[PDB]
């Protein structure tokens, strides 16, 4: 139909995050059979192949930002590919990798629909700046490049010349924040970004939280929704095989729930599954739980609802 | 600011509880870096050192109550030190240890603010009497010394001469009770204490529970709040390295949530982290999960909120 029409983009890129090993992100999610587990319900699945990530050998660092140009080239390439698959009328399933790719994943999505919304389900806001981080790791600076209210204040870090900030600060909702460095929360409070952290998640209940999140984004006007989803935003009892595990995340139930509310609007238009890392599970059973979690999250995004999915013929026959 | 201004009081005392080993309570919480993990956000941290616990050699037992005078001397000493750090205008971070210390921890807090409230987050009520317990262990009788409605009925057990009951039965809320011996629940029902056990926690949802808890304590009038927090009140999947583990506790998410609601009133005025015991984890990984849990609980008390914490300067610079 309109929804569950999928363009898969595997993006094995790592150089935004330091723990090398997330480049077996799309490989493990595909060998866990995400394609065929879509194909039971009416999923128009078209794999577009993995993106080539060239290696700039002299990707010389910035002041704090390190590996900048590889990240910027990867996200520009992904912005072109996301714009391609959104001109294909599909829902962009862009899975990596790391949050560095979400720059172009939101950018190329805005190249077709400039008035979308971003549900950034993550343990962290990932809105550090190149100037006021202390890491310089670009797996936590995608959102700072994308907000128009931050323009004139973001440095011209190389690789990011193509970057146009494309989303508004009032057009993004964080859900499941649980570890924020101080620069990101000043940005969070000064821009007036609406957010439901694990405080507000527990306060309203996850259902009233998704109710008010859809009342904030879609309560004004129907518009495309871009669920960009980290897998450390869930609790590390379910996904310990991630890059930055922080205890106290969402239960696996509620992660599936957030995806199902985004489905039952019928307005899912872009999906990111980042920070999957099979190299950091202490046992392969940890990796198995993590990858089965992220697969079933992606299933419940496109309408593998826990209520049921059907084909409209009589089955008493 | 007003909140996140911390006076740390380590209190390595054990003789209220039988399982010796909780006297490495403040040692492990400090070597897990609770001080420095406060110091990112605006935490005025002033360590006041550990309290000396002298050993009464002939601490002769009562009828059922055993090691009474060491508990009473420790809690009187702690009542003086809590009154000292509350005259310092800070929020009393008193971490042990065991719930025997919470006598003086609520008493010295009432010596400055006589009309406070107690959020006793614990698996147990810990309101046995010296007469109608069957243990006689003073890690479960602090609340019976402190309620004015129980006066004329508490024995003059030695060491407890200084004890003035200081809080009202309508001024205390239990959250997360899950194993109560019969004497404590008769006290609980006859005094008309408001409480939200894991029944009522699941009934309202943890957010509506904290909503009605703040509506019960602060809905009448703004007043100081004394979160006295056990670490067995959470589920032993997260803290198995405690003294009395009972299955069915709060999720680690919801424990962090209860602390964050107490923060976002801006009225946190006293904090207890008791029953941490590194000696009872079957693996050191169990101890590691338990201590990281209790540390991040203490962080989310003083406003390491999961939404974010900031310093008010522009970070796009």
């Amino acid at each position, epitope marked *: 139909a309109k929804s569950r029409t999928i363009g898969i983009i595997g993006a094995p890129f790592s150089k935004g995050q*330091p723990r090398g090993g997330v480049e077996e992100g799309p490989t493990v999610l595909r060998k866990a059979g995400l394609l065929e587990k879509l194909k039971e319900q009416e999923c128009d699945v078209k794999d577009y192949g993995d993106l080539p990530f060239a290696d700039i050998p002299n990707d010389s660092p910035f002041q704090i930002v390190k590996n900048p140009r590889s990240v910027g080239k990867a996200s520009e390439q992904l912005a072109g590919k996301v714009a391609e698959v959104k001109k294909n009328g599909r829902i962009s399933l862009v899975l990596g990798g790391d949050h560095s790719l979400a720059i172009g994943s939101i950018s190329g999505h805005a190249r077709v629909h400039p008035d979308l919304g971003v549900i950034w389900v993550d343990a962290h806001t990932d809105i550090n700046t190149p100037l006021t*981080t*202390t890491s310089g790791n670009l797996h936590g600076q995608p959102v700072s490049f994308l907000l128009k209210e931050l323009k004139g204040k973001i440095p011209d870090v190389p690789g990011f010349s193509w970057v146009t900030p494309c989303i508004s600060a009032k057009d993004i909702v964080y859900i499941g924040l649980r*570890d924020v460095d101080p620069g990101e929360h000043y940005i969070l409070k000064t821009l007036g970004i609406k957010y439901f952290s694990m405080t507000e998640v527990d306060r309203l209940g996850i259902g009233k939280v998704m109710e008010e999140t859809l009342s904030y984004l879609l309560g004004r006007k129907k518009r495309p929704i871009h669920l960009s989803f980290d897998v450390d935003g869930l609790d590390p009892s379910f996904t310990p095989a991630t890059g*930055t595990p922080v205890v106290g995340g969402l239960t696996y139930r509620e992660g599936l729930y957030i995806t199902e509310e985004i489905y039952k609007t019928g307005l899912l238009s872009g999906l990111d599954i980042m920070e999957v890392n099979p190299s*950091l599970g202490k046992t392969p059973e940890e990796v198995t739980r993590t990858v089965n979690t992220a697969v079933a999250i992606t299933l419940a995004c496109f309408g593998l609802a826990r209520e049921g999915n059907h084909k409209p013929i009589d089955y008493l026959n | 600011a007003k909140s996140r201004t911390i006076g740390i009081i380590g209190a390595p005392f054990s003789k209220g509880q039988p399982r010796g080993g909780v006297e490495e309570g403040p040692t492990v919480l400090r*070597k897990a870096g609770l001080l420095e993990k406060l110091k990112e956000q605006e935490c005025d941290v002033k360590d006041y050192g550990d309290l000396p616990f002298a050993d009464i050699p002939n601490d002769s037992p009562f009828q059922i109550v055993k090691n009474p005078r060491s508990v009473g001397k420790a809690s009187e000493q702690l009542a003086g030190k809590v009154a000292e750090v509350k005259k310092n205008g800070r929020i009393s971070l008193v971490l042990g240890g065991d719930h025997s210390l919470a006598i003086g921890s609520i008493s010295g807090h009432a010596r400055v603010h006589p009309d406070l409230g107690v959020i006793w987050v614990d698996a147990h009520t810990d309101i046995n009497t010296p007469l109608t317990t069957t243990s006689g262990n003073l890690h479960g009788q602090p609340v019976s010394f402190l309620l004015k409605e129980l006066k004329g009925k508490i024995p003059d057990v030695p060491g407890f001469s200084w004890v003035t009951p200081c809080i009202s039965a309508k001024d205390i809320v239990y959250i997360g009770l899950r194993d109560v011996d019969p004497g404590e629940h008769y006290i609980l029902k006859t005094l008309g204490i408001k409480y939200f056990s894991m029944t009522e926690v699941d009934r309202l949802g943890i957010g509506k529970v904290m909503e009605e808890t703040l509506s019960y304590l602060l809905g009448r009038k703004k007043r100081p709040i004394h979160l006295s927090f056990d670490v067995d009140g959470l589920d032993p999947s997260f803290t198995p390295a405690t003294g009395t583990p009972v299955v069915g506790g709060l999720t680690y998410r919801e424990g962090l949530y209860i602390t964050e609601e107490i923060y976002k009133t801006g009225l946190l005025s006293g904090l207890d982290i008791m029953e941490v015991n590194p000696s009872l984890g079957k693996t*050191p990984e169990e101890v*590691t999960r338990t201590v990281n849990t209790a540390v991040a609980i203490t962080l989310a008390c003083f406003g390491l909120a999961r939404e974010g914490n900031h310093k008010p300067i522009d970070y796009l610079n």
Partner: antibody
Amino acid sequence: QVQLVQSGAEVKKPGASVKVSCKASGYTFTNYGISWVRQAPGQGLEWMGWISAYNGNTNYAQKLQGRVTMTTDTSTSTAYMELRSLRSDDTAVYYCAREGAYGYRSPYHNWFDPWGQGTLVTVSS
Amino acid sequence: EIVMTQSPATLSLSPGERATLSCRASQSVSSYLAWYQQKPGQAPRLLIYDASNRATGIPARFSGSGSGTDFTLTISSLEPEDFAVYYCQQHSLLPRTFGGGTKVEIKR
């Protein structure tokens, strides 16, 4: 400058372990992360565990899970490594070095730049 | 357990010219490894931090390259204080293996 003063050369039978003191200085601590590596003499080297000093992330290695324990002491910038069920294969020089914390506020680091001086441990009874 | 293989096992070069060394990976470590200076009975100090770029107290002559399977350690201005067992060490895969040994002797 950026160093690691270790302590200290010690032999244990197969029994209790050697909590190796790995004292840091120079660089700001909990902005980075300290790991551990064994080296038997006349052999190669095996990394054996890395903690982030940022927040207690244990992250041990294969064949000792289990056997290793690693904590922080971040009052003083030291970090520690014990062992469990010691064995005469662990007649190794134990080095600690700084992999950088792989958290979120911690700078890009892949490369072990303090190196400590070593710790002569031979597990013989 | 990616095995890191150092192609010069031993080395004996005079005080003088380049002493380019080789370290190979069994996978793509991809510019994520380092170089060390283990003097006998000493601290195996860092030479080269992330396949390049010469960390923080390095003298003048310790360039190197890689990205991403078979890497180089160039000692261009040999400087006979540098006679030590050298180690490459991969990093960004667990568990974090090492090279074999690159005993830089004296050529005489």
